[PDB]
């Protein structure tokens, strides 16, 4: 029936006909709050453009008993659930969108879209024949996010994509109710933010001769110059574009590592500045933490960043400082450490990180960084452990290391965002991080005491672009796994259901097509062993039982009602698959249903699910599933037979 991603927190369905939008439908606002009237205005534009319906804005009371109308209410009952909470009440009488804060109305509108025909997103065609039903029945939805930090990071430093591409991704984020765009705009191989005071950051740092391709240390190169950067006016436009879709942009200025591009523009910023912007993705230059000129330079850059990014939080990265390749044995470093009594290179970075944390605070902002800023050497570069402590107000994004280190940071008073890279790096392949691993990700670190759970503010999924040079390849890596992380961030843990998610994702993919998203096609419709973890097992097959091609499984205790019962023959192990001819249901000793279609259950699964029509059970009778199958080229085969009721 209803198929929204993310699955809402609370829903109640009723019997009867659904609400339907028609050319006579109106959008009524039962409040004069200036923020709600704005949300209603763009809701009108958005819904009108997609349906082709007029949907005029009219004042409270001008409702027509001819068509169902959208009514926008301000209800403070939902304040306890946060500013993103909303409620939807839908019936042929009317569609009521309520929220304590105007942000909730926007999210109520996105859910409304996901309950209407997907042709809403089609840029062409005659929509006048379309029935704009809101789901299939009357219903009430009460919805709110589990986590407040639901982030997607786009790496535009490795490869630049530009305004048109980034807005297309913002459109997907908003439709999935992800609310933070983590914008990774500077790195070794590119600088993408116009800085008025330091024009060489873009005139030099935004251009490179060529790019390594294939993978790290491939020896391959495209011999193709690559350049691009955002003007400050372009950033203001994108910030506003995202803010209207409930998305805050968190910019990242990488430091003190990942600084090659910045250094080539102004070489005094690093003790080992390269001769040109690197054309490989393993070269990692570090800023000079011992020089006063670097902090002054970075404070100025962050001043212009603060002018164009209104968000409270500023990311500075701090990951993968190559201590031994950049700082060890450098006289400036060694003298600085003795002068300041520092014993390890982590102390050098901590001095840098704490000093930047104060600089950022004096601009009315909050520092955020990768977990390397917390003191411990997680990369194996010879930096040791930091004696000093990180400013407790700094936010830590945990990508690499033993999770006990992240729990330690939480217990020391830090807010944390979980981006464990073995689960959230969307630049990895579907073999390294399958869709199922993404959906199963749990941001709250296992073993963390309940009192500390509030410090886990959410998650971030990262799209690194070393090996992504086009929007279509960006889509392939980011979707559909980003859809899963959207649900991890929003849906309550108890309501999560991967088999159901996979069904809803098949419907959602219709929208991604019409919106131009070249998601990975082979990943959505997959059968996995975990789908049947809670499903009754009615039998198995072994090399012994494969001496027969006729197999009987009792299901008397399981046939309790008429309807569709699904038999799944799932291969477990063995050299050979089984060839399946048919599966049938018997009432006592007589056939009452049979699904005869060719199936093959092995390493690959093709048509392994058989649908049986059970009658209303006969009291006292036995019910038996009879499956006709043989080994395919051999008998070394093991598998399990599952039985799902309607």
Bond before 528 cis per omega within 30 degrees: no
Side-chain half-sphere exposure of 124, counting CA atoms within 13 A: 1
**What whole-number distance in Å separates Cα of residue 425 and Cα of residue 446?**
20
Q: Resolution limit in angstroms?
A: 2.5
Name the DSSP class of 292: H
**Angle at 96 (CA atoms; ends 95, 102), nearest 5 degrees:** 130
**What whole-number distance in Å separates Cα of residue 176 and Cα of residue 422?**
23
Taking a C-beta distance cutoff of 8 angstroms, is the pair 456, 413 a contact? no
Bond before 505 cis per omega within 30 degrees: no
Q: Please choose, from the candidates 109, 106, 104, the residue with its C-alpha nearest in 3D space to the C-alpha of residue 76.
A: 104
| 466 annotated as belonging to a binding site for a ligand | yes
**Angle at 383 (CA atoms; ends 381, 387), nearest 5 degrees:** 160
How much is the CA Rg of the chain, to the nearest whole Å? Answer: 29
**Following DSSP, what letter does each residue of 380-403 receive, concatenated?**
-SS--B-SS---TTSEEEE-SS-H
| 425 annotated as belonging to a binding site for a ligand | yes
Fold classification of 10-143 (topology level): Chitobiase; domain 2 (3.30.379)
**Active-site residue 320, yes or no?**
yes
Q: Which residue has the tokens 């008025």?
A: 196
Which residues, 6 or more positions from 425, have their beta carbon under 8 angstroms from its beta carbon?
399, 432, 433, 462, 464
CATH architecture of 156-492: Alpha-Beta Barrel (3.20)
**What whole-number distance in Å separates Cα of residue 401 and Cα of residue 523?**
28
**Angle at 278 (CA atoms; ends 273, 226), nearest 5 degrees:** 135
Which stretches does DSSP call E strand in 495-637? 537-541, 550-554, 563-573, 578-587, 590-595, 599-601, 605-606, 609-614, 623-631
User: What kind of experiment solved this structure?
Assistant: X-ray
Which sign, positive or negative, has the C-alpha torsion 213, 159, 154, 256? positive
Q: Where are the domains of the chain?
A: 10-143, 156-492, 529-644
| 322 annotated as belonging to a binding site for a ligand | yes
**What whole-number distance in Å separates Cα of residue 100 and Cα of residue 279?**
51
Side-chain half-sphere exposure of 41, counting CA atoms within 13 A: 8
**What whole-number distance in Å separates Cα of residue 415 and Cα of residue 395?**
5
Taking a C-beta distance cutoff of 8 angstroms, is the pair 184, 157 a contact? yes
Q: Which of 320, 332, 606, 644 is catalytic?
A: 320
- Give the count of beta carbons closer than 10 Å to the beta carbon of residue 418: 25
In Å, what is the CA distance from 564 to each residue of 58, 415, 442, 508, 615? 47, 49, 34, 25, 9
Domains 10-143 and 156-492 share a fold: no
Instruction: Report the first-to-last Cα separation within the chain, whole angstroms.
Output: 15
H-helix or E-strand spanning residue 72: strand 69-74
Q: Please choose, from the candidates 424, 496, 531, the residue with its C-alpha nearest in 3D space to the C-alpha of residue 152.
A: 424
| 108 annotated as belonging to a binding site for a ligand | no
Taking a C-beta distance cutoff of 8 angstroms, is the pair 621, 561 a contact? no
| 577 annotated as belonging to a binding site for a ligand | yes
H-helix or E-strand spanning residue 640: strand 638-644
Compute φ and ψ for 291, nearest 5 degrees: -105, 135
Name the DSSP class of 246: T
- Give the count of beta carbons closer than 10 Å to the beta carbon of residue 43: 25
Name the percent of the chain in helix, strand, coil, to the closest 5: 30, 25, 45
User: How would you write 164-218 as a 3-class SS string?
Assistant: HHHHHHHHHHHHCCCCEEEEECEECCEECECCCCCCHHHHCCCEECCCECCCCCC
Extract the tokens encoding 51.
């349906």
Name the DSSP class of 453: G
**What whole-number distance in Å separates Cα of residue 378 and Cα of residue 371?**
9
CATH architecture of 529-644: Sandwich (2.60)
**Angle at 431 (CA atoms; ends 175, 632), nearest 5 degrees:** 115
Which sign, positive or negative, has the C-alpha torsion 538, 540, 544, 547? positive
């Amino acid at each position: 029936q209803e198929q929204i991603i993310p699955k809402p927190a609370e829903i109640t369905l009723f019997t009867g006909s659904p609400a339907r939008l028609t050319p006579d439908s109106l959008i009524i606002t039962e409040t004069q709050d200036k923020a709600f009237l704005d949300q209603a205005g763009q809701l009108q534009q958005m819904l009108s453009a997609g349906t082709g319906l007029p949907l005029p804005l009219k004042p409270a009371g001008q409702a027509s008993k001819k068509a169902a109308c959208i009514v926008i209410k301000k209800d403070p009952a939902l304040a306890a659930r946060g500013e993103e909470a909303y409620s939807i009440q839908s019936s042929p009488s009317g569609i009521i969108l309520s929220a304590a804060d105007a942000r909730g109305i926007f999210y109520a509108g996105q859910s409304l879209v996901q309950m209407m025909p997907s042709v809403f997103h089609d840029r062409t065609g005659d929509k006048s024949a379309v029935r704009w039903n809101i789901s299939e029945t009357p219903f009430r939805i009460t919805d709110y996010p589990r986590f407040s930090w639901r982030a997607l990071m786009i790496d535009e430093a490795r490869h630049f994509f530009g305004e048109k591409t980034i807005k297309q991704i913002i459109d997907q984020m908003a439709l999935l109710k992800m609310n933070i765009l983590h914008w990774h705009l500077t790195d070794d191989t590119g600088w993408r933010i116009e800085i008025k005071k330091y024009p060489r950051l873009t005139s030099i740092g935004s251009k490179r001769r060529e790019s390594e391709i294939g993978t790290w240390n491939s020896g391959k190169s495209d011999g193709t110059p690559h350049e691009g950067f955002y003007t400050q006016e372009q950033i203001r436009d994108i910030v506003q574009y995202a803010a209207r879709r409930n998305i805050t942009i968190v910019p990242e200025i990488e430091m003190p590592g990942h600084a090659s591009a910045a250094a080539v523009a102004y070489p005094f910023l690093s003790l080992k500045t390269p001769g040109e912007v690197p054309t490989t993705f393993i070269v990692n230059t570090a800023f000079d933490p011992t020089s006063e000129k670097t902090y002054a330079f970075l404070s100025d850059v962050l001043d212009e960043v603060t002018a164009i990014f209104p968000g409270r939080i500023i990311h500075i990265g701090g990951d993968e400082v190559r201590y031994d390749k950049q700082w060890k044995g450098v006289p400036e470093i060694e003298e600085f450490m003795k002068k300041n009594g520092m014993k390890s290179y982590a102390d050098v970075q901590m001095h840098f990180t704490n000093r930047m944390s104060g600089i950022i605070a004096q601009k009315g902002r909050r520092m955020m960084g990768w977990n390397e800023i917390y003191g411990h050497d997680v990369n194996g570069d010879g930096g040791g452990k930091a004696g000093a402590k990180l400013d407790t107000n700094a936010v830590i994004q945990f990508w690499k290391g033993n999770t006990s280190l992240a729990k330690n940071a939480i217990r020391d008073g830090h807010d944390v965002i979980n981006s464990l890279h073995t689960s959230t790096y969307l630049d990895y392949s579907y073999g390294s991080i399958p869709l199922q691993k993404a959906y199963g990700f749990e941001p709250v670190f296992p073993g963390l005491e309940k009192q500390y759970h509030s410090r886990v503010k959410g998650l971030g999924a990262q799209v690194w672009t070393e090996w992504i040079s086009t929007p279509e390849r960006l889509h392939y890596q980011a979707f559909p796994r980003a859809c899963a992380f959207a649900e991890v961030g929003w849906t309550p843990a108890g309501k999560k259901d991967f088999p159901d998610f996979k069904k809803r994702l098949k419907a959602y993919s219709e929208r991604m097509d019409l919106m131009g998203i070249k998601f990975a096609r082979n990943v959505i419709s997959q059968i996995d062993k975990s789908d049947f973890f809670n499903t009754p097992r009615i039998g198995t097959w072994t090399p012994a039982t494969l001496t027969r091609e006729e197999h009987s499984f009792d299901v008397t205790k399981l046939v309790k009602a008429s309807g569709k019962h699904t038999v799944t023959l799932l291969y477990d192990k063995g050299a050979h698959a089984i060839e399946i001819e048919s599966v049938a249901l018997y009432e006592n000793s007589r056939e009452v249903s049979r699904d005869a279609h060719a199936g093959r259950s092995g390493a690959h699964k093709e048509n392994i699910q058989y649908i049986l029509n059970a009658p209303a059970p006969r009291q006292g009778a036995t019910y038996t599933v009879k499956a006709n199958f043989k080994g395919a080229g051999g008998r070394d085969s093991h598998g399990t037979v599952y039985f799902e009721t309607p």
